[PDB]
Amino acid sequence: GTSKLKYVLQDARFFLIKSNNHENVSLAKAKGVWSTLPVNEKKLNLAFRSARSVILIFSVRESGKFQGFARLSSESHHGGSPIHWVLPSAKMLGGVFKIDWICRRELPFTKSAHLTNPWNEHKPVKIGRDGQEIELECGTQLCLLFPPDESIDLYQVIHKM
Prior knowledge:
Elements: H1 3-9, E1 13-19, H2 22-31, E2 33-34, H3 38-50, E3 54-60, E4 65-66, E5 68-72, E6 97-103, E7 107-108, E8 116-117, E9 123-124, E10 133-134, H4 136-145, H5 155-160
Parallel strand pairs: 1-3
Antiparallel strand pairs: 1-10, 2-6, 3-5, 4-7, 5-6, 8-9
């Protein structure tokens, strides 16, 4: 069902995450981690303390799709391990967030064309820089568009809130 998903998304904050390549999203799905530039790291750390759930919605640049969404389980932390990100530096992409995936399935941008983001001038929600916040109602509807991921049990996610 979608009931536990809706519960997780209640009063959540949502952020668009743009990855330059598929490799880093694969690594994030395997290890439950994300790292971003310092400007966005600061925003996500503030958001993490401010909301019951902070949701990252991932899109690989030029893919025409979102690749899934995940909930922050922690603020960023340094000195944990050397995530072998594919970079275009390691110091900049420093500070690692732990994340729990809610959906690892893709959603093509063609399916979200009816959703606009008030916090980005009501442009289609697919449009935004890395770290762009997505208003609650837009973000909720976007997450509900993804195919259900029946490999994920939201029970343990709920327990962390």
